[PDB]
Structures are given as C-alpha cells and as structure tokens.
Design a protein around this nucleic acid. Structure first.
Lengths: 55, 95, 166, 55, 123, 72
RNA sequence: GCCUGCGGCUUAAUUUGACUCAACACGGGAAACCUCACCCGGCCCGGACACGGACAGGAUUGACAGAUUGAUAGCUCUUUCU
C-alpha cells in the first residue's frame, strides 16, 4: 500500500554544480556588504525592489 | 525560383524602399512586377529570406505584408547588382 | 540473478539494470542457507580480477516470491476529440488491438484510459479516457509476465589474481 | 507543385473563394455593400467605418 | 600596359557580372560560344581528362575564338567567383571552374589595353 | 475527438535521385585528328533552342530537353 | 405528413462545440466541389536562417514516348535530353 522511501530524491535530474570564482571572507566580505548598501546609492521613487528579487 | 526571378524582386526595392504582397498561394503573378512574370508566391519567400538574416522588416496588417530597408539592409543590395555609392535610394533624397 | 523492487507486496517488479543508489533483491537458485548471512557480489573483469559491485545481506529464502517482468508499449495520440482519441504506432495489426482490448491504458501526463474500437487494418485504435488529452502526450500500456532465474549453479569459482586500480 | 494541379480547382463562386479582408476567414462573412469582412471583424471596425448603433 | 600579362585578366571578369554573361562549366561554355554572340575564351592548363581538351579548343579557332592560358582549375574559378570568404576576407572555400566564356564586356581602358595586343603578334 | 494515426500502405513511394552521367558533354561532340567536329545529334527548329541547344537521340525518335518537342 | 437541429445506432468517416431556463432552424451551420476540420488514395514543400559535408570535370531543376497510374500525377521505371 503506497509508501516509497525517498522517491523524490531519486527522480530529480542530478545537475552538477557550476564553477564560480571564490567568495571574499571576513573583513573583505563585510567591506563588500557595506559598499553594496550605503555608498553607491541609486535613487528610486518609493523603494519596492529587494536585493535578491528576480523580476 | 530561377535566377531570372531572383533579380526582378531586388530592383524595385533599392529604388524605393518598399515591397508589398497579398499572401496568395494561388496567385499567377504579382502586379508591381508587371511584364516581368514573377509569381507572387515568389515575392513572399525571398522577402522571407531576408528577414531571418535581418534585412527586411515585417509589420503585418490585413493580409498584406509591409517591408522596409534596414540601415544594414541598404548596403546589402549594393554588392549584388553593383550599384555605386554615387547613387542614393529614395530615402536620402527629399528636403 | 534477477534484480527486483524491494517491496512489501506479493508482486515484485523486475529491474533490468542495477542502480547506483537503490536497494535491490537478487533472486537466484542457490543451496539454502539460513539468515542472517552477509552477501557479496563480484564480477570477473580482465586477467582474473574480481571486482566488488554490490554488497548486502541474505533475506528470506523462498521460491514463492514472484518477480514480474514489465513491458511498457508506447503509442501516439494523433487525433484528439474530447474524452475519446485515436492512437497509432502502439500496434500494427488489427487483432493485435483486439488481443489487448482488456488491458487498461495509461498516459504519461496521468490520464487513465482503455481502448474502444480498433479502426484501421493497420494498428489504429479509438480510445476512451477520463479527461481530454494534450497533443503533447504519449499513451502507454503495461504488460506483465512472471520471470524466474536461469539455472546456472557451479560451486567452483576460479582463484582471482591480486586486485589493482586502473 | 506542379503547376497544372497545384491550385487547379476553380476558386470562382462559393465560399471557398471569399475571405475576410481583415482576418482571412471564410465563415460568417458580410459581403453587403462591398464590406467583405467577417461578422466579428465588422464589430471591431463598426464605428471606424462609420456605422452608428442608433437604435 | 600597366597591368601584367596574366594580371590583366582580373579586370575583365569583374565587369561581365555587372551584366551577367559568364556561363561557367563544361556544358554551357561550348554551346553559348557556339551561339555566334561572344568575344573570346580561356582554357585552363590544370585539367585531367584527355577527352576534355580535345573538344574545347577545336570549336574555338574555327569560329574565330582565340585562347589564352592560365594554369589552374583553382585559379580560373575565383574569377568566376564561386569561392566563399571568411569574416576577415580570406578565400576560405574553393570550388573553381576550368572554363570561362565572356559575352559582354564592360568599359575599362585597363583591361582592354593589355590583352588585345597579345593576340596581334600571335597571328 | 482524438486522432487515428493511420501511417501504413505499400510502404513508401520514394522519389527520383538525379542521374549522374559523368562528363556527358564529351558524348555530343566527336573531334578527330584535324579538329573535325561532326555533331552527332539534332539542332532544334525552335527559337529559344536554335543554334545553341541540342536534342536527344533515343532509340527511334527525337526529344528536345528545353521545348519538349518530339519527332520519330 | 413533411423541413431541419440534438441525441441514440450502423458506418472507412456518417467531423466538432453546445445539454433546465442561460443546449437542441444554434455556431449568419440553407456544406453538390470548394468551405472541411472527418475518411481513402496520391501530390507538393511553402524546412527562413547559421555552420559542416558534398558540387562546377556540374550541386540541383523541368520532362515527350511506353509501362504503371483515376489523373497530358517526371509521382516511380525504362528511355537520355534539358
């Protein structure tokens, strides 16, 4: 009566991970988080756009 | 098409900038190409040949294709018939 | 051996190939041993190197555990009316369709149907369904037979040469 | 092709040789007063041709 | 006589395609020059069939057609113009013809000068 | 409605791939030692295929390839 | 009694949508062909374009005759010409 074990893990097409350039760490990362939020400010009328917001 | 039919279509374009059609498969001939004896089936697809390359512009309204010459479409017809850069089309003429 | 689904039911679906992550039941005529017992599987590669392919254990030993070989026959719905459609390329005769009349169809997009009339002298069939089919669809029926393993038992197995990597 | 039997059936009289001038359809056509449009494509351009629903 | 000997045949073949008279190949080149309408002809020297060279030159001098010589079959088709080009202008792909028949000339005082004098002293 | 597929007859009727007779231009003319040019086949009495286009030698007849004119 | 629409049933197919008012002389649906989606047999390419293969010593196009073919359908075959 029904009941597979981990059906949806074994049905998913195994997509290999892309090779990107490494992330900066520590103080370097914080620096990049600072300049992305307070320094190069782009003007908007009411601010309705997020940071990750894809479309 | 035979090569007699290919080069009738291209003469009336560079003079003017416009070629039109009726979208008729049963058509014996196109009326602009008069006493030149090209079926109007042949006006369509050579003008469909230059769209996928990027030369003519489709903008369709009421069963009759309209077409213009691209800025890059201008230089294409000057290599085929060899018209010189001494002669302009009807675009750069008036006023 | 015969590989199978490791289920709790009576019928076990045959697996035609051994999968890299699934746990499978190998079914073979061997002289009866009592569980629990470990079970290893090797294969003679080249120059007599035994290659470990599959590890497990011994489950219940009984001939009553039926392994079922399935055959899924594809077809094409090329004419679609509402709830009744015309399928080709699943059969090629007329009485091929008439043989598999009581076989209930299914569909890749999840429709559950069954054949009505055969029409052509070539394999064409009218088929009823629960809902309306997409044209982008594929009709398919499932056929089953019971399969039992080959009698290839020899207790003698050659001594392997020392194993190495490629 | 070929030319002798490609479009050989005579598209004289009859609704296989009348099309809407807007949408190239052959059903529901209004050919009164030389409209030659479909009955639905008349209702888009009913006012722009100049017909008024007075009563 | 500024254009050189085989060099002067580059200007000749460009002008006819303004008015479309270069019938290429083996089959039309005999017949369209049988047609009492065309001026001259060339046969290439790189040519492999023995029955090829027999038929071509015999119809010429009877119907008052003089012959020049250039070597290659690769060479006398780039003047016919079948060869495709790359993005930077390299002759990427070659399918050349070993026969040319010129029917209508253009008007070039570079092309007409050098090659017509070649024929007088040959007589 | 759903579609009956119906893809079956006496299986195919394949088309004509074009005949490659290699160097058939050598067949028409025959040149002797002096340059003798005897034209083996017929010149058409028409206008568009006169003096440039030759005709056909079948087993009992004539058949032009341009204007499709037939003698015997 | 008949005209036409729906179901129902035979049919190669007797296309299809519509199902209480709010489906059923409705789809301007009075379809000989066409329309036409349906069924049978055949044709055409109407696969633009980019790149590779081939191809000019011709890639390919058109085809009388006769057989076949409903078809003066070069559609296939012989015939060998364009």
């Amino acid at each position: 009566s029904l009941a597979r074990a981990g059906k949806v893990r074994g049905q998913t097409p195994k997509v290999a991970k892309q090779e990107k350039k490494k992330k900066k760490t520590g103080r370097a990362k914080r620096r990049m988080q600072y300049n992305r939020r307070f320094v190069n400010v782009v003007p908007t009328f009411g601010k309705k756009k997020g940071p990750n917001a894809n479309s | 098409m035979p090569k007699k039919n290919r080069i009738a279509i291209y003469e009336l374009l560079f003079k003017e900038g416009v070629m039109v059609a009726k979208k008729d498969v049963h058509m014996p001939k196109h009326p602009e190409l008069a006493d030149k004896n090209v079926p109007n089936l042949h006006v369509m697809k050579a003008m469909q040949s230059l769209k996928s390359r990027g030369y003519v512009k489709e903008q369709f309204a009421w069963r009759h294709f309209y077409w213009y010459l691209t800025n890059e479409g201008i230089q294409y017809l000057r290599d085929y018939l060899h018209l010189p850069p001494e002669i302009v089309p009807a675009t750069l003429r008036r006023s | 051996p015969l590989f199978s689904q490791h289920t709790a039911a009576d019928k076990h679906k045959l697996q035609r190939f051994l999968t890299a992550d699934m746990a499978l039941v190998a079914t073979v005529y061997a002289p009866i041993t009592f569980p629990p017992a470990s079970v290893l599987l090797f294969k003679q590669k080249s120059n007599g190197m035994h290659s470990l392919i599959a590890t497990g254990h011994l489950m219940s030993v009984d001939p009553d555990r039926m392994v079922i070989k399935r055959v899924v026959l594809s077809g094409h719905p090329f004419k679609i009316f509402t709830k009744m459609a015309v399928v080709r390329y699943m059969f090629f005769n007329r009485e091929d369709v008439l043989w598999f009349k009581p076989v209930e169809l299914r569909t890749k997009w999840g429709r559950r149907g069954h054949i009505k009339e055969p029409l052509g002298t070539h394999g064409h069939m009218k088929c009823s369904f629960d809902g309306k089919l997409k044209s982008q669809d594929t009709v398919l029926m499932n056929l089953y037979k019971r399969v039992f393993p080959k009698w290839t038992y020899d207790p003698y197995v050659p001594e392997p040469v020392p194993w190495l990597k490629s | 092709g070929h030319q002798q039997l490609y479009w050989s059936h005579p598209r004289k009289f009859g609704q296989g040789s009348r099309s809407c001038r807007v949408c190239s359809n052959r059903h529901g056509l209004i050919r009164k007063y030389g409209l030659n449009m479909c009955r639905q494509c008349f209702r888009q351009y009913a006012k722009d041709i100049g017909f008024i629903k007075l009563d | 006589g500024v254009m050189d000997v085989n060099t002067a045949l580059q200007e000749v073949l460009k002008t006819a395609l303004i008015h479309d008279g270069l019938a290429r190949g083996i089959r039309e080149a005999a017949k369209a020059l049988d047609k009492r309408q065309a001026h001259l002809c060339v046969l290439a020297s790189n040519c492999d069939e023995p029955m090829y060279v027999k038929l071509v030159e015999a119809l010429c001098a009877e119907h008052q057609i003089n012959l020049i010589k250039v070597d290659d079959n690769k060479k006398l088709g780039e003047w016919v113009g079948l060869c495709k080009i790359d993005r930077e202008g390299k002759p990427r792909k070659v399918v050349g013809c070993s026969c040319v028949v010129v029917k209508d000339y253009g008007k070039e005082s570079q092309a007409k000068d050098v090659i017509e004098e070649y024929f007088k002293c040959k007589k | 409605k759903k579609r009956k597929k119906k893809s079956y007859t006496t299986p195919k009727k394949n088309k004509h791939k074009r005949k490659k007779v290699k160097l058939a231009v050598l067949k028409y003319y025959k040149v002797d030692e002096n340059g003798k040019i005897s034209r083996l086949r017929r010149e058409c009495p028409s206008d568009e295929c006169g003096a440039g286009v030759f005709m056909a030698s079948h087993f009992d007849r004539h058949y032009c390839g341009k204007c499709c004119l037939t003698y015997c």
